[PDB]
Design an enzyme around this catalytic site. Structure first.
Site, short mmCIF file in Angstrom:
data_model
loop_
_atom_site.label_atom_id
_atom_site.label_comp_id
_atom_site.label_asym_id
_atom_site.label_seq_id
_atom_site.Cartn_x
_atom_site.Cartn_y
_atom_site.Cartn_z
N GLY B 26 0.81 -1.21 0.00
CA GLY B 26 0.00 0.00 0.00
C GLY B 26 0.85 1.26 0.00
O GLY B 26 2.02 1.22 0.38
N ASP B 27 0.25 2.37 -0.42
CA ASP B 27 0.84 3.70 -0.36
C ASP B 27 1.47 4.07 1.00
O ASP B 27 2.45 4.77 1.03
CB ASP B 27 -0.22 4.77 -0.67
CG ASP B 27 -0.58 4.86 -2.14
OD1 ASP B 27 0.04 4.19 -2.99
OD2 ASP B 27 -1.51 5.61 -2.45
N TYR B 28 0.89 3.62 2.10
CA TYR B 28 1.43 3.94 3.42
C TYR B 28 1.74 2.68 4.21
O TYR B 28 1.67 2.69 5.43
CB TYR B 28 0.44 4.82 4.21
CG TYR B 28 0.26 6.20 3.66
CD1 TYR B 28 -0.46 6.40 2.50
CD2 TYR B 28 0.86 7.31 4.26
CE1 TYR B 28 -0.61 7.67 1.97
CE2 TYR B 28 0.71 8.59 3.73
CZ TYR B 28 -0.04 8.76 2.59
OH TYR B 28 -0.21 9.99 2.00
#
Lengths: 95, 200
Positions: B26-28
């Site tokens: 995921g992005d974060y």
């Protein structure tokens, strides 16, 4: 995700894979829309950041529990956002 | 004889070596480090690095980057035994030692070395935080003078089970996993209490 057996890291991985999938669904759906539908270039990344900041409140909840809830929040918010973007696209089409 | 934290070991460290890294999807997603998979997402690994003998190895290096992972795995290669133990001590200092104290602040003392009840305290502090009120709340209004280790273990684990839906309102697809764990740790802590072992 049927053999977590309460192993914390395995639960996080499951949630995180769902988050990534939802991010990719959202990002690709926005990408696929004509200059017509009016999505700013930075729409996804701004909404994603705001979601992150919202769910990062759970840093104030201790232990495994706070971490699980943080990740679960990320997922539910992205799911909400995916449904909203769909519905908007529909409302533009229905016009 | 009995290693503190062994009962919940499989949920926390799960046999992992001190050099394991996972990159979160995921992005974060960030990254998670070591035996206990301390994440960069919530500042845990950063706190560990500040406290570590290897702190300066990581000078200039941010977690969830290849550079940081290179250095983390170098240390785990070249000092496997010390790294593992420093990691374990960090989990102890930031959960168990803190819960022992927090409980003392509620008037609950455990000045002995019986393994079962101390595994309970470790487990709970890791799952709910060093400052969790879970144990206090589960023991609320009982007579500590005349309560057995077995009773303590029963009250705490039933509290966990029965409040799962409330404490994890936001995450219902995990209730089944979480409830089972509470049941399973109860069994294992009860067996451990009968063997009447010692820790620390």
């Amino acid at each position: 995700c049927n053999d977590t057996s309460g192993v914390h890291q395995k639960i996080l991985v499951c949630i995180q894979n769902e988050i990534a999938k939802s991010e990719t669904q959202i990002r690709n759906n926005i990408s696929s829309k004509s200059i017509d539908y009016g999505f700013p270039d930075d729409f996804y990344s701004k909404q994603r950041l705001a979601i992150h900041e919202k769910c990062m409140l759970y840093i104030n909840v201790g232990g495994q529990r706070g971490e699980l809830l943080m990740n679960q929040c990320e997922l539910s918010m992205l799911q909400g956002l995916d449904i909203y973007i769909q519905q908007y696209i529909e409302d533009v089409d229905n016009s | 004889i009995w290693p503190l934290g062994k009962t919940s070991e499989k949920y926390e460290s799960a046999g992992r070596g001190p050099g394991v890294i996972s990159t979160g999807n995921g992005d974060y997603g960030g990254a998670s480090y070591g035996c206990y998979q301390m994440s960069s997402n919530l500042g845990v690994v950063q706190k560990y690095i500040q406290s570590s003998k290897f702190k300066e190895f990581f000078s200039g290096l941010n977690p969830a980057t290849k550079e940081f992972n290179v250095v983390w795995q170098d240390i785990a290669s070249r000092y496997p035994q010390e790294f593992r133990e420093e990691q374990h001590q960090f989990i102890k200092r930031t959960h168990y030692d803190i819960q022992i104290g927090h409980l003392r602040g509620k008037g609950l003392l455990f000045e002995h070395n019986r393994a079962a009840v101390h595994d309970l305290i470790w487990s709970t502090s890791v799952q709910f935080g060093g400052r969790t009120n879970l144990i206090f709340n589960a023991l609320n209004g009982q007579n500590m003078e005349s309560m057995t280790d077995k009773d303590i273990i029963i009250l705490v684990q039933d509290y966990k089970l029965v409040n799962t839906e409330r404490l994890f309102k936001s995450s219902p697809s995990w209730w089944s996993d979480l409830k089972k764990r509470a049941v399973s740790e109860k069994k294992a802590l009860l067996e451990l209490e009968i063997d009447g072992l010692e820790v620390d």
